[PDB]
Structures are given as structure tokens and as C-alpha cells.
Assembly symmetry: none
Homo-oligomer: 255 residues x 2
């Protein structure tokens, strides 16, 4: 039975590599340096546009770029999830419900892989946007990203690799407590299989790191808090900002 868990761990790792182009292993090499164009101010940003082609006020244009990347990440996560044993066999409404609530948690988890205390990798790690330059953005866009940076520093201190995160990300999607689910049993049943695989992966991959499993599950709290806080900021934005309004079709795509 102990080998059925290693098979699952490897399966998910292999699926996670295929599904996510920029991985933690790679993102770390770029950040440590073992090279990316840096954006520290308005002049560097406007050269960034020039020398890095990535798809009105700066603050608004930056926030919207973060959204266009988030919509991309949603498709990468959807693909990944369909490789999780049991997932495609679930009721289609449940599959949609699990992805609807799980994507934000998984976005901010994986964004930690692209972050250090100084800034975040953007455009497949072609760019690096400084924490300071983002804080400098006129309110309320100033402390848009500051909560994610604070999560990342704490999350990154667990020194998880792609092999650990692959299983953790699966655990997040198979949350049996999402609103509106029709058949909670097979979901919880899969998450229990994924939690065993994670427990074992963490004991084998981090033998000296005591109760890492327990610490990693506690981070679930930090994720949902970050997501509720991000959702609250979208309300404050939508209501108090006029210059948001895009092309009506664009508004449909980027809900």
C-alpha cells in the first residue's frame, strides 16, 4: 500500500511539470541567479513594455495585467486537476464547484514560488516587479499585492519543492466543504488518499523537518484569509473606481 502513495506522488509531480511551465525549481534559479528584466519605477516599467511584450493609468493597467495572468493560471489548474485520480469520474457540477472555489487558493500558493521578500517574477520569469514599486502604486492598488508577499515569505520558509506542492495543490482542489457540492463522499475519499500521499512525501523528502505536514495544513487558514481579503478589495475597487470599465466582451472574459 505504501508504494501506491509514491506512484500517486510521482504521477502528480509528472502532471504538475506538464501543466505549469514556470516551476518553483526554475523560479528559484532565476531569483537566486544560478537573467530577468527588473521593474523598480515608472521609467523601467515603460522600458519593460518596450523590451518585454506582455498582454490609461499605470496602477489600473498593472492590476488588470495581474487579472489576465490569473485567467491563464485558471486554465493551467483546470488541466492539472483532470490528471488527479478520481477527479474526472466526479459529477460535472462538483468538478466545476471544486475548481470555482479552489483556483484563488492555488493561484496564491503557486505565486509564492515566484516571490521573495524583494519582488515577484512576471511573464514566465522574463520580468521581476519589486515589492517596493508595487507598494508605491497610488491607493488602493498600493497594498493590493502586499498581503500575498506577507503570505509568501511565511509559506516559502517551509522550503517546499514542486514534488511537495503537486500533492498539496491536489488536496486544495478536493476540499469537501465547498458550498453547493452534491456528492461530498467521493471528494473527501480522494482528499484522504491525497493527504496520506502528502504526509509520506513530506516524511521521505523532509525527514529532519518535524510536523511539516501539520504546519502545511495550518497554512490553509492563511490562504482563505488572503482570498477573502482579495475578494473584499475587488468590491472596494469595482464600486469606487470608474476608469476600471473595459470593452464589454473583456468584462465578460475577466469576471
Amino acid at each position: 500500500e505504501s508504494a501506491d502513495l509514491r506512484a500517486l506522488a510521482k504521477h502528480l509531480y509528472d502532471s504538475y511539470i506538464k501543466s505549469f511551465p514556470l516551476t518553483k525549481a526554475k523560479a528559484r534559479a532565476i531569483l537566486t541567479g544560478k537573467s530577468p528584466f527588473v521593474i523598480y519605477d515608472m521609467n523601467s516599467l515603460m522600458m519593460g513594455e518596450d523590451k518585454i511584450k506582455f498582454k490609461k493609468e499605470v496602477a489600473i493597467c498593472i492590476f488588470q495585467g495581474c487579472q489576465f495572468r490569473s485567467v491563464e493560471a485558471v486554465q493551467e489548474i483546470t488541466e492539472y486537476a483532470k490528471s488527479i485520480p478520481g477527479f474526472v469520474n466526479l459529477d460535472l457540477n462538483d468538478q466545476v464547484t471544486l475548481l470555482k472555489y479552489g483556483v484563488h487558493e492555488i493561484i496564491y500558493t503557486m505565486l509564492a514560488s515566484l516571490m521573495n521578500k524583494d519582488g515577484v517574477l512576471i511573464s514566465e520569469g522574463q520580468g521581476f516587479m519589486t515589492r517596493e514599486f508595487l507598494k508605491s502604486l497610488r491607493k488602493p492598488f498600493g497594498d493590493f499585492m502586499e498581503p500575498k508577499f506577507e503570505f509568501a515569505v511565511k509559506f516559502n520558509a517551509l522550503e517546499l519543492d514542486d514534488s511537495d506542492l503537486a500533492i498539496f495543490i491536489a488536496v486544495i482542489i478536493l476540499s469537501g466543504d465547498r458550498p453547493g457540492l452534491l456528492n461530498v463522499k467521493p471528494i473527501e475519499d480522494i482528499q484522504d488518499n491525497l493527504l496520506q500521499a502528502l504526509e509520506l512525501q513530506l516524511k521521505l523528502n523532509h525527514p529532519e523537518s518535524s510536523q511539516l505536514f501539520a504546519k502545511l495544513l495550518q497554512k490553509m487558514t492563511d490562504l482563505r484569509q488572503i482570498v477573502t481579503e482579495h475578494v473584499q478589495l475587488l468590491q472596494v475597487i469595482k464600486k469606487t473606481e470608474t476608469d476600471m470599465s473595459l470593452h464589454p466582451l473583456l468584462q465578460e472574459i475577466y469576471k
Copy 2:
């Protein structure tokens, strides 16, 4: 072989998405229309009495109310096709202006492709299949409104004779969206590479699903000619209503799709 396996993977992915993006499928539509069942029976609207009693039975001047109701449904459909488009591998990775352009031109060709699923020679399902509004009643509407649906009906009767199922339609409406020949497209090349891969998937899907149906692929592609024609007629028709009906409002999303269209 492994090349075919990848095309079956893509076919299955698009079907799965199609089913999640569109509540009323063709499989459901036909089960309602071929009226085999006791629970799925549609209320039929053939005249003014039937329309007014339909108010109490189904939850939602006459010709205007139909057209305005038919408008909000078109909008609801654009929202559904937009959600489906995001699921097409590569679509959200394209230049954002191109994404908008593919939908601007794509959505009305797809609205009328899928509307065929809700149509037989006699009428069209409405209100998520709870209602059925007869072809005659729609044609008996005041000028010019009498003439909106007739060409769609003419298309639907021909198109429905190909006997496509939802799995075929998912790939087909993907091929429509990823059209490189749309006016104003910045990056045509990445779109054709996607459409090429979709077209390979459809070719295989049609050969496996309809192996006794010779050159269905060819015949299906040729139907994209008839869609363009329907869209054009409709656009000319809107221009005329705009002018004779100054006291009737079009929904902005549709106004924006038609703005500088062909």
C-alpha cells in the same frame, strides 16, 4: 497511435467544457422536441392567447417584447460562449485585443449554430426548453419583425440534416472561434496553429462518430458559408429597426459586437 490519442484527449476536453458552459444541450433539446416523455413537455405558443397564458405557465406591443426577450437571450448566449472560449487550449494565452476580436465575429455564427439544436422545421425551444414558439407565429409578426427567424429556420433544417451530436458541435464551435481571417487580427499565425489542431480533432471526431457519413467534414466546413450569410441578413435587419423603431433599445454588449462589423 499517440498523435490520434492527443486529438481524442482534446475532443474529450472540449466536450466536457461544452457540457459545463451550456445548460440546454442538443441531446436535451431533442428529448424535449421528439416529446417521448411526460415530464419534459414544452408549452406551445402559436398565437396571442397562447403567448399571454404562457406568462403564467413559463417564468421569463407584442413583436417588440419577443425581440427584446430574444435580445437578452442572445446576451446570455454570448456569456456562455465566452466561458466556453476560455476553455479552448491556447485561447486565453493570445493577445488580448485578438481575444476580443475572435468573440466579436465568432459569437453570432455560434449562436445560430447552437440555435439549430433548439429548432425543427415547425418551431424553436425558448425559456431553457420550457416553451416552444412555432415558426408560423414568428412569421405572422408585424413587418419587419416577421422575417428575423425565417432564414435561421431555413439554415437549421439543412444543418440539422448533418445529424451532429454535442461532441461534434463542441469541436466545430471551437474551429469557428479560432478563425484567422477576422478583420483587425494582430497575430494571425498563433490562431491558425490552434485552429489547425482543432480541425485535425474535428476530422477524427467526425470519422469515428459518423463513419458511414462520407465527407461530413467537408460538408460541415461548407456550412460556415451559410452562417456568414445569416449574420449579414440579421445586421442589415437591425439597421432598418434602428430607423423605424427609435423608441426601442439594443443591449450594449450586442451594440458593441455589431459596431464596425464587416
